[PDB]
């Protein structure tokens, strides 16, 4: 299963690195998309993009590296891609799940959960989990607002795969 990382910067200040395991065994197309967006091996990806929507005790959303507001992003597949399956459930904090705009609209946007969010089960594809740096995810969450607006910008300063 791929392991990938993101170094996070908050306002001016390096916060640390989040390492993530991607569940290619469960959701191969989804895991591969996110992997390539971490390495930029297809010519584009997450580096320098932001977590543009952060809601405390809920989730930190990013991956909109085109419009930086929730309206953009793109998958490696040239088009949005289907929900692969909903086997993995939103059982606690520290999980990777795809943002979308309805069935079969996966692109590059994703969120890291900050609690168990089981009301999203069957609506969003979960595809990975944080293996180190849960505390950096907490620092991201610390910039959140009820309405999602970040108090300071949170940037993926660097990212890649191990």
From Swiss-Prot:
What is stated about the way this protein's activity is regulated?
Enzyme activity is inhibited by cyclosporin A.
Task: Please tell me where this protein is predominantly located.
Answer: nucleus
Where is the protein found, in the record's own terms? Nucleus
Q: Name one GO biological process term.
A: mRNA splicing, via spliceosome
Q: Which GO terms describe its molecular function?
A: cyclosporin A binding; mRNA binding; peptidyl-prolyl cis-trans isomerase activity; poly(A) binding; RNA binding
> Where in this chain does the record put each PPIase cyclophilin-type domain?
5-161
Entry superkingdom? Eukaryota
Write the record's keywords in alphabetical order, separated by commas.
Answer: Isomerase, mRNA processing, mRNA splicing, Nucleus, Phosphoprotein, RNA-binding, Rotamase, Spliceosome
Q: What's the catalysed reaction?
A: [protein]-peptidylproline (omega=180) = [protein]-peptidylproline (omega=0)
Found, by tissue, as follows: Found in all the examined tissues including heart, brain, placenta, lung, liver, skeletal muscle, kidney and pancreas.
The listed outcome for residue 58 to A is:
Expected to disrupt proline isomerase activity. Abolishes inhibition of KMT2A activity
According to its UniProt record, the EC number is 5.2.1.8
GO cellular component terms?
catalytic step 2 spliceosome; cytoplasm; cytosol; extracellular region; ficolin-1-rich granule lumen; intracellular membrane-bounded organelle; nuclear speck; nucleoplasm
- Free-text note on domains in this protein's UniProt record: The RRM domain mediates both interaction with RNA and with KMT2A (via the third PHD-type zinc-finger), but has much higher affinity for the KMT2A PHD-type zinc-finger.
Family, similarity comment = Belongs to the cyclophilin-type PPIase family. PPIase E subfamily.
State the protein's purpose. Involved in pre-mRNA splicing as component of the spliceosome. Combines RNA-binding and PPIase activities. Binds mRNA and has a preference for single-stranded RNA molecules with poly-A and poly-U stretches, suggesting it binds to the poly(A)-region in the 3'-UTR of mRNA molecules. Catalyzes the cis-trans isomerization of proline imidic peptide bonds in proteins. Inhibits KMT2A activity; this requires proline isomerase activity.
Protein name from the UniProt record: Peptidyl-prolyl cis-trans isomerase E
Q: Tell me what organism the protein belongs to.
A: Homo sapiens
């Amino acid at each position: 299963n791929p392991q990938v990382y993101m170094d996070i910067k908050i306002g001016n200040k390096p916060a640390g690195r989040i390492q993530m395991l991607l569940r290619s065994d469960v959701v191969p197309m989804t895991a591969e998309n996110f992997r390539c967006l971490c390495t930029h091996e297809k010519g584009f990806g997450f580096k320098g993009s932001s977590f543009h929507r952060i809601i405390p005790q809920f989730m930190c959303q990013g991956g909109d590296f085109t419009n930086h507001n929730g309206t953009g992003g793109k998958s490696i597949y040239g088009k949005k891609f289907d929900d692969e399956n909903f086997i993995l459930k939103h059982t606690g904090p520290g999980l990777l799940s795809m943002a979308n705009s309805g069935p079969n609209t996966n692109g590059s946007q994703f969120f890291l959960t900050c609690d168990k969010t089981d009301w999203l089960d069957g609506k969003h594809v979960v595809f990975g989990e944080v293996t180190e740096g849960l505390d950096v995810l907490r620092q991201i969450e610390a910039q959140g607002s009820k309405d999602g607006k970040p108090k300071q910008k949170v940037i993926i300063a660097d990212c890649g795969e191990y």
